[PDB]
């Protein structure tokens, strides 16, 4: 009987990244892979294993990406892409930043954006003095249908209310003004 003995597969591989501000060293060269998984099991043994974002450094990142995609603009699956960005005041790290990362993880390890999952590329955290932010990246910015139920159904799993209103951006935007809100 498998169910007794075998990890749960999940629907894709993820790729864990870990960015840390050394001015000494290109954006690029700051950005390190950290491991990879595909089941739930593995998951947690690495989400338990590491600190929690509010414990990093201010100028830390985590991204989780979908392996084969890297975090970063000039991927071919985001440069035509963009994010569905959450910004967090001073107050939040401590009330939000890591309840709502650890339910971002989720939507994407369970897939939980029914058929437009597949245009998730992956998620990003930034730790920083200013203010954090956490950003779903999907990978077509024109792609309304997939852009606007995702931005939905995100906001409702972070149980935002509709007093706030969350924006859309364009890499392309970013690399050089929101398309979409909800």
């Known amino acids: 009987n498998p169910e007794h003995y075998i990890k749960h597969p999940l629907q894709n591989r993820w790729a864990l990244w870990f960015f840390k501000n050394d ?73 939000d930043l890591d309840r709502f990362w650890l339910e971002t993880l989720l ?30 990246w999907t990978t077509e910015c024109e792609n309304r249908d997939a852009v606007t139920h995702i931005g939905r159904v995100y906001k409702e799993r972070l149980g935002l209310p509709p007093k706030i209103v969350i924006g859309y951006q364009s890499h392309a935007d970013t690399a050089t003004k929101n398309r979409f809100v909800v």
């Open 107 to 136: 939507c994407l390890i369970g897939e939980s954006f029914d058929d437009y999952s597949d245009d998730v590329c992956g998620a990003v955290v930034n730790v920083r003095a200013k203010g954090d932010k956490i950003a779903i």
């Open 23 to 95: 001015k000494s060293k290109t954006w690029q060269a700051n950005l390190r892979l950290i491991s990879k998984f595909d089941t739930v099991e593995d998951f947690w043994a690495l989400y338990n294993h590491i600190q929690l974002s509010s414990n990093l450094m201010p100028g830390c990142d985590y991204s989780l990406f979908k392996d084969g995609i890297e975090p970063m603009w000039e991927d071919e699956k985001n440069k035509r892409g963009g994010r569905w960005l959450i910004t967090l005041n001073k107050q939040q790290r401590r009330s």
